[PDB]
Design an enzyme around this catalytic site. Structure first.
Site, PDB file in Angstrom:
ATOM      1  N   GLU C 161       0.970  -1.169  -0.077  1.00 21.82           N
ATOM      2  CA  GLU C 161      -0.056   0.008  -0.021  1.00 21.82           C
ATOM      3  C   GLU C 161       0.836   1.364  -0.022  1.00 21.82           C
ATOM      4  OE1 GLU C 161      -0.479   2.468   2.717  1.00 21.82           O
ATOM      5  OE2 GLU C 161       0.781   1.300   4.183  1.00 21.82           O
ATOM      6  N   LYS C 220       9.102  -0.970  -0.403  1.00 17.11           N
ATOM      7  CA  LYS C 220       7.988  -0.207   0.547  1.00 17.11           C
ATOM      8  C   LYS C 220       8.633   0.487   1.852  1.00 17.11           C
ATOM      9  CE  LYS C 220       4.200   1.242   2.793  1.00 17.11           C
ATOM     10  NZ  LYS C 220       3.889   2.704   2.605  1.00 17.11           N
ATOM     11  N   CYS C 276       4.222   5.173  10.689  1.00 19.43           N
ATOM     12  CA  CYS C 276       4.981   4.588   9.578  1.00 19.43           C
ATOM     13  C   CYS C 276       6.430   4.747   9.513  1.00 19.43           C
ATOM     14  CB  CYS C 276       4.216   5.023   8.371  1.00 19.43           C
ATOM     15  SG  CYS C 276       2.518   4.602   8.177  1.00 19.43           S
TER      16      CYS C 276
END
Lengths: 228, 460, 460
Positions: C161, C220, C276
């Protein structure tokens, strides 16, 4: 007192005032409290280093490192001074003429053993400075020897016959020995023929009291234990 | 609002030369005079053959030289006449003393400042265009103040160069931005606006950024640091790729497609070179140490440490593949320049890869299609070079009986070599160490031929 | 070439929810089923009020829910029916054991892998969409192989994502790129192409990048690391600015106008927050240590160290300005969320600034227009909170008799406060510590009023 002098420069305090205030305590006394570029002589460092080695040999590392501090502080004091000079000259001293007034470890002697002038000079030589050294008592050949290991001394070191020949076109005047005669110089004459901005670095507090004079003349004057 | 009619630039280097030629080219009403103490450069600039090579430069010079563009060794007179003085002398890294190997030496800049104040009177704008350490403009102002005269008003600005050597003209005529820093006072602002006016002749006002003088000096160092950081970051990733089976070119692509990250400066390699990246990061690091900012210094030092790690890691892969013994083994070194399409070897990774292999006693055969032979010998000296270094006239002479071929520069021609021919005359097992990802796509070919091919950021 | 008709996503979080709603929205012919063990979320998704808030999401869900979009707690059945299985469960950082505080805990992912293989037969594509540590797909394959059946062919893909929480819908419908990693074998390639086909319904093929599965997983982590590095880099610069007189906003602008660097993620602050950046960099660092890559680990650790330095430095400026004593001094904390326009406080710099000040015994009055009161108390607990923390209903109640106002979140409303009113009721000397550069432009105003105003990256 030298460690305190570093604190004075950083706080706005004055080492000579502090030294006096401290020294008026009968229990501390007022001898050996005059801050400077660093102690010299053939006794102090030699005997402290011997004391430290003694401690190491006897498995006393806490005592050894306690006394080692006296030498480390003295080395720091010299390095700090040299660096102030170098930073004031924009961290470049390559081919800059610099007058070194005083080479003996203290006034009224020709003895240069462990003189702080030797270490200040060498720091400045590692920057490629053109040092012009003057001392009224120290023999010429002694200075050349104390700065050798060579060609570096040949290139960078000139030994002046009089102080004014050493300050002629110099960027800075560095005073390393407390000779009384340095107090009596014609600083008006010196300034006219120095490159601008012209610096005086007083490493022995001999020019205390003459600051406002030197400042109105046009000098930028800095010294041990006094904030810039 | 003051107008600049005469410009004097001190330094006929790759910075002052092209910039002033362009200024003269877009401002016919301004008389630009480039000076330098080197009589060689000056007479070369006025010669049909220019002392530096830039695409489109020769045309610019010949268009203006004699009308408003002049090259002279007469520095004193060019200073006297000029309204604007560009200081464009280099600031070499200190090779001794406080800050050895990191700090910038301001000796030439200070010399310019003293020479300027000596030969100048009235109003003049003095601009530092060369890369300087931060607060160098304070040093210049301090010289000016101490050497003041009646009616002397020298204003000090910062206007750093952002041209990549090789595309100087394109970078000058169509810059991403022009940066001008000045003191935030009425006097400083007037001087900034005067310099803007010069650039407004061919640069849109949107792409002209004005700051205070310290932000300008620092921006030049930080910009190069950020660029270098990008390279070291992708390189650190390449090491992870080799250890995980990921592929750095795939990873770089996925990362760079993020608009916020962008896709420039993400090509992994044996390590960045050039006379700017390491020099300016080291200067940035020294600045932080001097300012009692050890956390920041060690942050930026990582950019350099990673780059050194990348080179050492590469050499170690080569050495281990040859069983940790390289004594008298022939090794081909293809490419010596720090990047392709140039003869410049300053801080070239080939120098460091070659030197690591020389410490193993390797017999290096070096080939580069552009780098002069004498330069390679110079870059590998301190006896040792005589014993271990052979300079090949052609790549095949370098791969004749070699145990391994090491590619250190991304020259396009290396992709097109007759690898079937090379393999036949190599010792087995035959290795190719691709330090630039140039043989990507040729992997299956080289392997069926018989090569053991290893490269940056790909698991073996 | 296989076509995907039924999709099952495990996890109704901010990742699986919006992504599957959009997929259902651009692929009416595909039946998408989102499942989660939490009955609360599932019943909320089928309720008129959704368990998460995203702009444009409510419309997407109501358009598809009942036709091809379904939310259920029946995980086993959704697995059985599905052609594609998205694994979208979170991977929390380990709170104990090897890798405590850094390594990702794969417990939920492994649980999904065992649950999938249990309730599935035939051909199914299993895709990990949640952020995973590199080579997690190896872990999944290892579970599948050991628990094999006749006619069982589970293909494992990686499809991370890239949506920022807050603009999920916009990021999904118009992504910079879609990333899909698969094994470089005929079987793996067929599975990759099947997943591409789904995205080709609304994503141009130019913006779909295919890699091997390890490059995808690593991309990612690296992407977030690069973003975070940009922030810590500008922050390190802000410290230099404070020490030199440069200005970080001026420097950021000059740097960002370089096309190769870009102007995103260059706004200096008290420090980056969010669930994150730190989490993924720490995971990246642990990965390197585990793979015997200590130079790379320490390279990336700098991103975190700088961020911690930035926060500590900020708190220290506040404390020193208050004479290194803050016992019982009232201090206004304006903004608690990790960024503006959200109630999320995860890794918010306000937490760390508040805690540093609490260690000084300060009386903090905290105000945030969106963050729930009970959340702030939770984020400051381990007694101490009771003594030192007051939560203000309005900003003026927080600045009433305070020695200093500290702004930690860039809420737009803080720019518009009646600073004349605030100053009248503050203790003198009155400080404002701007940790977000929000009061830029208001400096001369606040100073004439009587404030001592200090901020990130500007010399005092």
């Amino acid at each position: 007192i030298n460690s305190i002098s570093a604190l004075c420069e950083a706080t706005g305090a004055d080492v000579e005032e502090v030294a006096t205030a401290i020294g008026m305590d009968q229990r501390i006394g007022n001898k050996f409290l005059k801050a400077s570029v660093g102690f010299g002589g053939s006794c102090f460092q030699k005997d402290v280093l011997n004391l430290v080695y003694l401690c190491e040999a006897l498995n006393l590392p806490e005592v050894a490192r306690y006394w080692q501090q006296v030498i480390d502080m003295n080395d720091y004091q010299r390095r700090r001074f040299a660096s102030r000079i170098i930073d004031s000259l924009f961290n470049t001293v390559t081919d800059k003429k610099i007058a070194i007034l005083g080479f003996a470890f203290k006034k009224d002697t020709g003895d240069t053993r462990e003189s702080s002038s030797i270490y200040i000079s060498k720091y400045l030589m590692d920057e490629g400075a053109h040092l012009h050294i003057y001392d009224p008592k120290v023999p010429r050949e002694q200075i050349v020897v104390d700065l050798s290991h060579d060609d570096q001394v040949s290139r960078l070191v000139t030994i002046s016959k009089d102080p004014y020949e050493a300050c002629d076109g110099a960027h800075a005047v560095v005073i390393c020995t407390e000779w009384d005669m340095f107090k009596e110089l014609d600083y008006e004459r010196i300034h006219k023929k120095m490159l601008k901005p012209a610096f005086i670095f007083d490493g022995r507090r001999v020019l205390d009291g003459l600051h406002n004079e030197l400042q109105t003349i046009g000098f930028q004057i800095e010294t041990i234990g006094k904030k810039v | 609002m003051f107008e600049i009619k005469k410009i004097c630039c001190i330094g006929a280097g790759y910075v002052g030369g092209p910039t002033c030629s362009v200024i003269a080219h877009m401002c016919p009403e301004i008389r630009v005079t480039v000076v330098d103490v080197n009589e060689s450069r000056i007479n070369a600039w006025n010669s049909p053959t220019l002392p530096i090579y830039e695409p489109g430069l020769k045309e610019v010079v010949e268009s203006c030289r004699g009308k408003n563009l002049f090259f002279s060794t007469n520095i004193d007179d060019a200073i006297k006449e000029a309204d604007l003085v560009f200081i464009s002398v280099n600031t070499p890294t200190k090779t001794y003393g406080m800050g050895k190997g990191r700090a910038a030496d301001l000796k030439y800049i200070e010399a310019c400042a003293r020479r300027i104040v000596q030969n100048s009177n009235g109003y003049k704008i003095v601009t530092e265009k060369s890369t300087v350490p931060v607060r160098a403009a304070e040093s210049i102002r301090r010289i000016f103040d101490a050497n003041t005269k009646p009616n002397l008003n020298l204003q000090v600005l910062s206007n750093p160069e952002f041209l990549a050597e090789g595309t100087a003209i394109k970078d000058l005529k169509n810059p991403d931005r022009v940066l001008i820093g000045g003191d935030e006072t009425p006097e400083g602002q007037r001087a900034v606006q005067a310099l803007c006016a010069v650039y407004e002749h061919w640069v849109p006002r949107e792409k002209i950024l004005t700051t205070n003088t310290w932000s300008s000096e620092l921006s030049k160092l930080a910009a190069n640091a950020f660029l270098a950081q990008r390279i070291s970051s992708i390189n650190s990733i390449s090491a992870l790729c080799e250890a995980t089976g990921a592929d750095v070119e795939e990873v770089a692509t996925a990362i760079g497609m993020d608009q916020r990250i962008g896709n420039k400066f993400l090509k992994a390699s044996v390590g960045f070179g050039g006379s700017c990246f390491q020099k300016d990061v080291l200067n940035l690091v020294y600045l932080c140490e001097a300012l009692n900012l050890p956390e920041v210094a060690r942050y930026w030092q990582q950019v350099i440490d990673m780059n050194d790690y990348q080179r050492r890691r590469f050499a170690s892969r080569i050495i281990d593949s040859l069983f940790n013994t390289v004594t008298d083994k022939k090794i081909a070194i293809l490419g010596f320049a720090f990047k392709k399409d140039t003869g410049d070897t300053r801080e070239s990774s080939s120098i460091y890869i070659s030197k690591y292999l020389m410490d193993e006693g390797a017999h290096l055969h070096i080939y580069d299609p552009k780098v002069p032979r004498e330069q390679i010998v110079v870059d590998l000296s301190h006896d040792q070079v005589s014993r271990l270094v052979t300079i090949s006239k052609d790549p095949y002479e370098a791969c004749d009986g070699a145990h391994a071929v090491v590619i250190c520069t991304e020259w396009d021609m290396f992709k097109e070599l007759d690898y079937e021919r090379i393999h036949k005359k190599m010792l087995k097992p035959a290795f190719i160490f691709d330090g630039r990802r140039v043989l990507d796509g040729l992997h299956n070919e080289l392997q069926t031929i018989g090569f053991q091919i290893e490269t940056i950021g790909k698991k073996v």
